[PDB]
Amino acid sequence: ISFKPGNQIDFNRLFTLPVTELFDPNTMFVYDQYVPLLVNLPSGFDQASIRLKVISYSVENQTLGVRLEFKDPQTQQFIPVLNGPQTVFQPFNQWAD
Amino acid sequence: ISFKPGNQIDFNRLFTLPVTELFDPNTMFVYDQYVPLLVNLPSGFDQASIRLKVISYSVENQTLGVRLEFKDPQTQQFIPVLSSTGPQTVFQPFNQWAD
Amino acid sequence: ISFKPGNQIDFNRLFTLPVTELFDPNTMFVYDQYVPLLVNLPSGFDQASIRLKVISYSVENQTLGVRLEFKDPQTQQFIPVLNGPQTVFQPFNQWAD
Amino acid sequence: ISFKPGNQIDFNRLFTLPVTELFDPNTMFVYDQYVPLLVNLPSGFDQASIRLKVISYSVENQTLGVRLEFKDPQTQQFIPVLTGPQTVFQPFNQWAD
Amino acid sequence: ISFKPGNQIDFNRLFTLPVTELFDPNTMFVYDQYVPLLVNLPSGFDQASIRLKVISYSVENQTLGVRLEFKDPQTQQFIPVLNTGPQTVFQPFNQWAD
Amino acid sequence: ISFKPGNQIDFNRLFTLPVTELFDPNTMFVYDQYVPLLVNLPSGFDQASIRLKVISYSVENQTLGVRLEFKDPQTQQFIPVLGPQTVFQPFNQWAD
Amino acid sequence: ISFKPGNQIDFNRLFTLPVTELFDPNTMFVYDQYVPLLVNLPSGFDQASIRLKVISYSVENQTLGVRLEFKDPQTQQFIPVLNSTGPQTVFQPFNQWAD
Amino acid sequence: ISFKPGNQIDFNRLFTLPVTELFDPNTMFVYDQYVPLLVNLPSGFDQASIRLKVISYSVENQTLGVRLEFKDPQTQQFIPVLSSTGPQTVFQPFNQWAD
């Protein structure tokens, strides 16, 4: 007689990772599987056309300093999206000060 | 002439399942095909890199108690995020009509 | 120890009405209180500046045919949007053969 | 040298309340200011045209059993849509066991 | 000397199809490429685990009557959800009618 | 038996207005009732704290050149939110 | 024969302010007009029923440390949300292009 | 304890390009990688089943005039949505600060 709504769990309630675990220490690129977690992508976007180079990181602030790059379709080379850690951000929720 | 808007159907209007049918009783993992139904994944996220371990369930309340595991990029083995015991979340995956 | 997500209820799970109860037949205008239910208004938009004229309806299909009028800010009179009904739609979910 | 994206805070990260504080214990109606927190309202909806009657509540589960009432346009009296609650739900995130 | 905001185009402003072109007339299943247009799928959903069976259609009203089938994870066979007749009857695209 | 989904109508399917009707030409400010149509406002935003000054308009292209202004809370004066500072086409058009 | 879509000016993407201009230095409350810009409020929520107390701020990081207060419906007085010391949240309200 | 919200990089808000760089000048089709940036596609839609033909463009106004083509499931060939000679839509894909 009563409606009881269901729930889908938000991914951020289940997953978190130290920033030092988000990138390959041998290439210094964010692992492919984490690129959709760090970047808000449009529907159907081809992830092979982009990459995130890690320039810096902070264990204390849980931030990454990255260079977002995209594959130029004419030259087939990766070039920066924005024109040094070009973008500095905190990928996951933190509880501190 | 009049405009007649179309519609796209919400997936919850077409699909529902008892909680006991969402997971393999032998491994206690939610079947791969249902993981995107239970978890709101970010756009473009690949479900193959994660799995949901069933810690508890209730037939009476139609709820699941789950813990997330992710595939370690170096070893390719599934590892838990960071509880040691107990579920990370207890939730009712589908709409119910009961009370 | 376990996260139990909350829920906000969608208005369509709680409210439904026969199409003949949505408008005053004496004027053929949708009652003011239902205009934001039938039309997705932009955030902050004032419902008092518009009205919905009922051009047709179907008891069998539970549909309404509507045309929109807006209050001219200089004359304070309602005037039709220029260039039958502008739209024919089923305002609420139905379960029927 | 670095882009640092900003953020707006989600209201659910700042506000929570025990279910017994959501309604007047003498009338059993949800306080007006909390109706938009419990129900996802359409944009520009006139909240004065509805009210939420509390039929049941659970201190243990932090749930409410509600019935929506709407103001009949002709008589200006509150009437139920269609006795027990229409819906039983948990309005806020909980951390239990 | 002036900001001019940009725009992304909504898919419904560019695409429409007669309902009879949405499904294979030999199998009565909606073509794979159109399933995300008819159903709002969760992010990352594996479309290979489902199919949409066409039960009815109307050329006059441009509607489809469909039933969802899902692949049973143990048997790997497609089975209907719970249950004759369609689960839903709807008009997939915007129409302009007299 | 069969579920038949309902619909809420998008406002742009019902409302359009020539750009010359969006503002009071005596003051050159967009009428208060149209500010939420031209600007995407956050939920609960106080519209009394903003105004849109019309700097130019095109009848041919149905575009407005506006200067978005907000009321400084310390004083009570309207100041621009950084010629028109913003040129846009408020409504869908069909042309060639 | 060509569709040209209309557009709205997106307020929150154009508006920016130094954090020190968001609150009254005498009361330490965020000015009423900015509360809907800093907080994503549910549809139809009455902003007059809440206020944001500034506990800390950083000119260097352009962040605010805030605590939310709500108007108790019975007493009509603003009370903190407690379910005592420091801010509930520290956040950067606007995009920054720092050195 | 203070909550410090996390943030994702918003691709669409950072990505901008001159309109002449969005399409192959030899085929007059928008490069495949940009189609999801220009068009809001439904969740799970396969972008390989569509293409955007550039009918016109303006360097001065930074606009594109496009027509959509879709892959016929039976023939595996691209066909227009419908013979029209002009664009279905003329739009400005990115924010501009021009004079």
mmCIF file of C-alpha atoms in Angstrom, chain B residues 1-6 8, chain C residues 38-42 52 66-69 81-83 85-89, chain E residues 9-16 91-96, chain F residues 7-17 37 90-92 94, chain G residues 3 5:
data_model
loop_
_atom_site.group_PDB
_atom_site.id
_atom_site.type_symbol
_atom_site.label_atom_id
_atom_site.label_comp_id
_atom_site.label_asym_id
_atom_site.label_seq_id
_atom_site.Cartn_x
_atom_site.Cartn_y
_atom_site.Cartn_z
ATOM 1 C CA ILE B 1 -0.051 22.048 -35.970
ATOM 2 C CA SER B 2 0.671 20.790 -32.435
ATOM 3 C CA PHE B 3 3.938 19.634 -30.857
ATOM 4 C CA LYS B 4 3.659 16.103 -29.348
ATOM 5 C CA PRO B 5 6.712 15.389 -27.177
ATOM 6 C CA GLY B 6 8.384 11.987 -27.272
ATOM 7 C CA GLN B 8 12.624 7.822 -23.269
ATOM 8 C CA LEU C 38 2.789 20.891 -16.614
ATOM 9 C CA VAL C 39 5.592 23.187 -17.845
ATOM 10 C CA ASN C 40 9.265 22.895 -16.932
ATOM 11 C CA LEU C 41 9.859 26.544 -15.911
ATOM 12 C CA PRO C 42 13.385 28.071 -15.769
ATOM 13 C CA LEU C 52 -2.008 28.147 -20.185
ATOM 14 C CA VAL C 66 -2.454 23.947 -24.549
ATOM 15 C CA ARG C 67 -1.334 27.363 -25.824
ATOM 16 C CA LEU C 68 0.756 29.770 -23.700
ATOM 17 C CA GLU C 69 -0.109 33.443 -22.959
ATOM 18 C CA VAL C 81 2.605 33.746 -28.090
ATOM 19 C CA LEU C 82 2.360 34.147 -31.913
ATOM 20 C CA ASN C 83 4.987 32.443 -34.176
ATOM 21 C CA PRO C 85 -2.825 24.093 -29.701
ATOM 22 C CA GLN C 86 0.944 24.759 -29.513
ATOM 23 C CA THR C 87 1.258 21.317 -27.755
ATOM 24 C CA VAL C 88 -0.769 18.129 -27.083
ATOM 25 C CA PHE C 89 0.630 15.987 -24.263
ATOM 26 C CA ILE E 9 23.329 20.734 -29.519
ATOM 27 C CA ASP E 10 20.695 18.380 -28.068
ATOM 28 C CA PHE E 11 20.617 15.031 -29.935
ATOM 29 C CA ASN E 12 16.754 15.287 -30.432
ATOM 30 C CA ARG E 13 17.249 18.446 -32.575
ATOM 31 C CA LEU E 14 19.284 16.341 -35.079
ATOM 32 C CA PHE E 15 17.861 12.789 -35.003
ATOM 33 C CA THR E 16 14.455 11.244 -35.677
ATOM 34 C CA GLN E 91 6.258 7.635 -28.541
ATOM 35 C CA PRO E 92 10.105 7.622 -28.822
ATOM 36 C CA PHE E 93 10.427 10.838 -30.868
ATOM 37 C CA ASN E 94 8.845 14.299 -30.937
ATOM 38 C CA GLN E 95 6.020 14.501 -33.513
ATOM 39 C CA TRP E 96 4.154 17.470 -35.105
ATOM 40 C CA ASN F 7 5.442 14.449 -19.982
ATOM 41 C CA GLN F 8 6.246 17.902 -18.570
ATOM 42 C CA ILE F 9 6.596 20.452 -21.454
ATOM 43 C CA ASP F 10 9.887 22.323 -21.939
ATOM 44 C CA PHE F 11 9.260 26.072 -21.608
ATOM 45 C CA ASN F 12 11.110 26.819 -24.952
ATOM 46 C CA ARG F 13 8.443 24.773 -26.839
ATOM 47 C CA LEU F 14 5.744 27.259 -25.685
ATOM 48 C CA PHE F 15 7.417 30.637 -25.169
ATOM 49 C CA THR F 16 9.205 32.985 -27.490
ATOM 50 C CA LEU F 17 9.254 36.759 -27.692
ATOM 51 C CA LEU F 37 14.576 33.425 -18.800
ATOM 52 C CA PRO F 90 17.807 34.384 -25.969
ATOM 53 C CA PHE F 91 15.398 32.198 -27.979
ATOM 54 C CA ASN F 92 15.598 29.479 -30.664
ATOM 55 C CA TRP F 94 14.821 29.354 -37.683
ATOM 56 C CA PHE G 3 17.833 25.782 -36.508
ATOM 57 C CA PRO G 5 19.471 27.427 -30.688
#
